Design an enzyme around this catalytic site. Structure first.
Site, short mmCIF file in Angstrom:
data_model
loop_
_atom_site.label_atom_id
_atom_site.label_comp_id
_atom_site.label_asym_id
_atom_site.label_seq_id
_atom_site.Cartn_x
_atom_site.Cartn_y
_atom_site.Cartn_z
CG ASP A 1 -22.12 28.83 11.93
OD1 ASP A 1 -21.23 28.07 11.46
OD2 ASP A 1 -23.12 29.18 11.26
CG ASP B 1 -25.37 26.17 7.53
OD1 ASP B 1 -25.98 26.03 6.44
OD2 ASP B 1 -25.34 27.28 8.12
CD1 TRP C 1 -30.47 34.82 11.37
CD2 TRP C 1 -30.58 35.08 9.14
NE1 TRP C 1 -29.71 35.92 11.04
CE2 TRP C 1 -29.76 36.10 9.68
CE3 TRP C 1 -30.79 35.04 7.76
CZ2 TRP C 1 -29.16 37.07 8.87
CZ3 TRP C 1 -30.20 36.00 6.96
CH2 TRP C 1 -29.39 37.01 7.52
MG LIG Z 1 -24.30 28.29 9.67
#
Ligand SMILES: [Mg+2]
Ligand SMILES: [Mg+2]
Ligand SMILES: [Mg+2]
Ligand SMILES: [Mg+2]
Ligand SMILES: [Mg+2]
Ligand SMILES: [Mg+2]
Lengths: 367, 367, 354, 354
Positions: free
Chosen positions: C179, C227, C306
């Site tokens: 990420d 994202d 998550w």
């Molecule tokens: Mg992310």
């Protein structure tokens, strides 16, 4: 809950003052599905192709597809429409029009079980009364214009003029004579080519009539042809038959290939997928109708329920075959057009209780 | 079966009331091919460029190409048109217009052998009578308008107006005066630029006449120029000369570069390739004509046979040079225009029996 | 049924979380939560959350909480944007709906496809050897997927970290995401993928804007996930329809709630685009909401849910709060979110509307 | 000549095949066949086949079976889509035509380019070592091409299978295809090609939709073939004209019959796009039809004709049925399909139309 029984029915529906010319149809065979739970609670679905030539779907085909899937659905939880759709895909590829009958029956059953209208399971009732639209048949220009004026007088807020299958000069004359009768009434206009126009003729129709505010609905046979003429056509273009699945809608919305949709519930595969379709359109301000090809109270109520959840400014209407059908399934709460609009049924589920006797014994039963 | 002999003939055809102005032509030299099988059975082909400047092809060129290939074709099976085409490609690159003469002769021979019309070897007769279209020469606006009206009165369902090679104001005046004479007769209109318009002028022609329903046929010299103006032109655009091979048709269809075709049988390389071309167009609803540049009964019958297999709604017509030719090859069954249409010959093969004497002795023979 | 009261709470975890309690006429209550992971990760913050809720709440009294789409449009009519705040109201209404009908939220969103939902572990930025150890420890605990955070330092170090992590987890069947958290110039995102073809990561939000990602996509042979760029359904539709990415990390609060999250899921499923169902941070309420939508995802496309639970000492619901076990999360059994917050932990509301 | 009778048969192979017998006025008969490889591979199934045929048959009585294009349009006028069912009628008419003129079907489709047609062997999904062994055994038997089926499991295993197969067949001059059967997310299709540049496979239908394939094509250095996505001629024209693929696996029943298959062949030949001539499954009749169109393909572009024969115990025609020998198929000698089915094997028709 679990599915205990699935019953498939074949049933005939003749068109009052037929034929209806799009596929030319003189009578229709619809297919009904009854899902029965462990508890004995029941839900109803329906699928009815508008002749065998309008879309890759037919009556004998619906029943064969349903008989293929039904034994693999006994024991499934009918309160989980997405899980149920995946289970169906694991039994038969494609055949959305048949899967939609099962999906509708499952939502009907869910609504009755929880005591809630199907529209409220799909995000909620945005309007108790939903607009409809009138689709003229192909015919003589002056006669189609007369019918258009009469339907506007009845209260229809939108008209769809079917064209094609003859020289485009005649289609163009029809559009102009209709506009002459309805201009200044605030009525919206669609012109439906039903896949029959070569790009040559779709270009001419738009080029010749900039001052007539129609949208051009599915003018050409393929999405590829539509994508090629889009840049050269100054009227909005809607997809209908080309909108075969959610993946294609995502392509058309995301690449800007159309300005709206005429969407059929059976084609997309049922209410679970139709709700997603609705959300894509709303995010992009793409107006759309919630229709089907044909059928009685069951499929009509399903279309009306999803139609009632659509943002009013984006709602191009719900088309139903009711005015062409002699005998409703539910004389007390069945779907009726009144003043060019449709009142949503008030009861739980689809709000429809079919007179089961009308259908005859099932042509196939599964347990 | 096996090819035993190939005979190449040179033959003259003068234009009645010439010249014909596109390439300006006053008389034509056509090239004929006779294929003779082991059994003595014979088949005929023909190729005839419309002057040396219209396309990269000419009469002396056709005969040199045919003499190049013929010794390598002795012994080949004439009943296998695709195998035969590949064998030809292995002897000479390009030269579709010459390969087409051999391809046609082979289908003629096949039809006679099996006792079947060439159209039925290409998928089947869809219509016994095929539409034609009249192509006006370049001339004075008022005179072209007079001729247009007269040809509509004869029964031609479509007219092609040739323009270019002079200031575009004159072309525009011609188009308007023709439209004034034929509007409301249902006659279809094409305007053929014959590769002669800069994009400047093609844009002006379309921009100035939105209310005149022509298609713009091959307005510019290159496919690249056509692709560049397409988005800015609201009339349909057809390719003609640019349609040089099946690969290019696939590019134009698949990338949406045109709305139709004027297709010449000799240019694409013969009937085997023409049938594939037809199938591509039908899959995409692209209207097209089945033409050639010029020639007598043999090439005309070949065009008529493929034309008879085309879906009627997509058939823009079969053009033939017959009205400009004094002496037909076959006085009993030769191709004739009647009421703007052409009746398909009824006999096996092309249905044509050439008066072999007319052609003179062969300029080249091979065995 | 109608909304009679809306109560807003502030609670420390530190991170400042914001809880919403919706009370119907009957007294039946639903709970929602929103908790920005610091005011710099996203255009969202705790004070902003409470301000936005204060703006909308009075105009929501009397609304039907059993109609999530009608409710969303009503919110839009009161305040433009602010999805992270709208999400708290949307979640509370689904909780209430579930309790009213006696159904789990996941069965209001299409149905439970799995009772045991996969999670994934996200390493914070740190030294390459230390990150590699934590990677191996977390794989052993059962997490089927690891996300390695990089950026904000010379890319040589990020590349070293990726290679050492891979050394430790290769052959364990663990999936890997790297990420960039909007922090890589194209220059460095290109180098990362170019140097590591044999390491099977997906590159998650490497660059700051969707524009930059579209510009490098053709030159990058690793799958790319969006994202932070997936701000709303309209942008998801662009990315999916134009083929600009190969998957998503999606945050419930960013997209505006479960109603929109369900449509996002359906879009991804139609295009076989894998995705996670996450959020920025927060306790049992937001964690339960993510678990519920996660339980509806096609297992082969589920990149995991998550949750902040391992970093939070005090659960709202001691009996049935969301817990990670063996790298997975069990869906609560009860109606609604299946969670019952101990309201005494939050103190009195900082704002009440009636 | 006119169609006087159409008879539909059901026969087990299990897989449920559907046979069609067309009888002309003269009594001359032609045979066709269609057999979906299970109802989940394609939008087609056995019950659907018979329903579609029952829908069209009455409207075909009196038609001229010697005009395959006119016949196809007539079918289209009776039922939209359903190519897999239309194909059975199309094949029977070509069989009849061939018998009428005394010519092999291949010589009605342009001419025999080869009497001995190459085949290819398709491994089912299985364990990497076991698939690699079968690969080597089949190469030894003479198959010039192998297709390895993958997907539906972690891609690490698919990659291991490909590498082990290659170990066994490298240097044998065998061509390799890896078939994803619509099952790979872009993520995994990218990884497969990225990790294996030295292995010369083509990637066949890796992803579910043509849209997904167009989206990864520029990032994938292996040739990509379309199979299931090639649903009709219009889609082939898009793929060829826009350069979206490097070849095709084409199924006769999917495209709607030999008339359309011939046009598809001509499109591929114009663009030098290699292709196979296959079908889903079935016995001598459909196998013969595929062999006939296969015999017309330019040898350098012929990726082979696949048939189900090795998996079928009872041939319809004991003397002249289609058999694989040395990884190749000999074209039958007789007129029409060159096949004469023993009708006693099928039992009486399940439907007859007159
Ligand atoms: Mg992310
Ligand atoms: Mg329509
Ligand atoms: Mg021309
Ligand atoms: Mg593990
Ligand atoms: Mg070998
Ligand atoms: Mg395949």
């Amino acid at each position: 809950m679990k599915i205990a029984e699935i019953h498939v029915y074949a049933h005939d529906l003749p068109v009052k003052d037929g034929p209806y010319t799009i596929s030319t149809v003189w009578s229709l065979q619809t297919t009904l599905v009854k899902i029965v739970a462990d508890s004995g609670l029941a839900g109803w679905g329906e699928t009815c192709p508008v002749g065998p030539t309008y879309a890759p779907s037919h009556a004998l085909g619906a029943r064969a597809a349903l008989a293929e899937m039904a034994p693999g659905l006994i024991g499934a939880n009918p309160l989980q429409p997405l899980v149920l759709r995946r289970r169906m895909d694991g039994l038969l590829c494609g055949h959305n029009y048949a899967k939609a009958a099962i999906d509708i029956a499952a939502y009907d059953l869910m609504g009755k079980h929880y005591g809630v209208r199907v529209a409220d399971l799909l995000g909620g009732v945005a309007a108790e009364r939903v607009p409809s639209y009138y689709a003229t048949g192909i015919g003589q220009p002056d006669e189609i214009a007369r019918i258009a004026a009469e339907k506007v007088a009845e209260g229809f807020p939108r008209l769809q003029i079917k064209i094609g299958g003859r020289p485009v000069e005649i289609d163009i004359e029809t559009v102009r004579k209709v506009w002459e009768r309805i201009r200044g009434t605030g009525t919206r206009l669609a012109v439906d080519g039903n896949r029959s126009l070569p790009s040559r003729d779709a270009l001419r129709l738009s080029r010749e009539c900039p001052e007539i505010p129609f949208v051009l609905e599915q003018p050409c046979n393929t999405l590829e042809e539509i994508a090629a003429i889009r840049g050269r056509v100054q009227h909005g273009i809607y997809l209908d038959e080309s909108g075969e699945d959610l993946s294609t809608v995502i392509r058309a919305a995301g690449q800007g290939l159309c300005d709206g949709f005429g969407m059929k519930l059976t084609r997309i595969g049922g209410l679970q997928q139709m709700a997603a379709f609705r959300d894509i359109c709303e995010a992009r301000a793409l107006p759309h109708s919630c229709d089907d090809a044909w059928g009685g109270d069951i499929i009509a109520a399903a279309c009306t329920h999803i139609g009632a959840t659509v943002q009013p400014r984006l709602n191009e209407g719900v088309w139903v075959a009711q005015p062409y059908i002699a005998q409703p399934y539910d004389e007390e709460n069945g779907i009726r057009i009144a003043g060019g609009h449709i009142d949503l049924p008030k009861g739980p589920g689809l709000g429809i209780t079919p007179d089961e006797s009308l259908f005859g014994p099932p042509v196939a039963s599964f347990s």
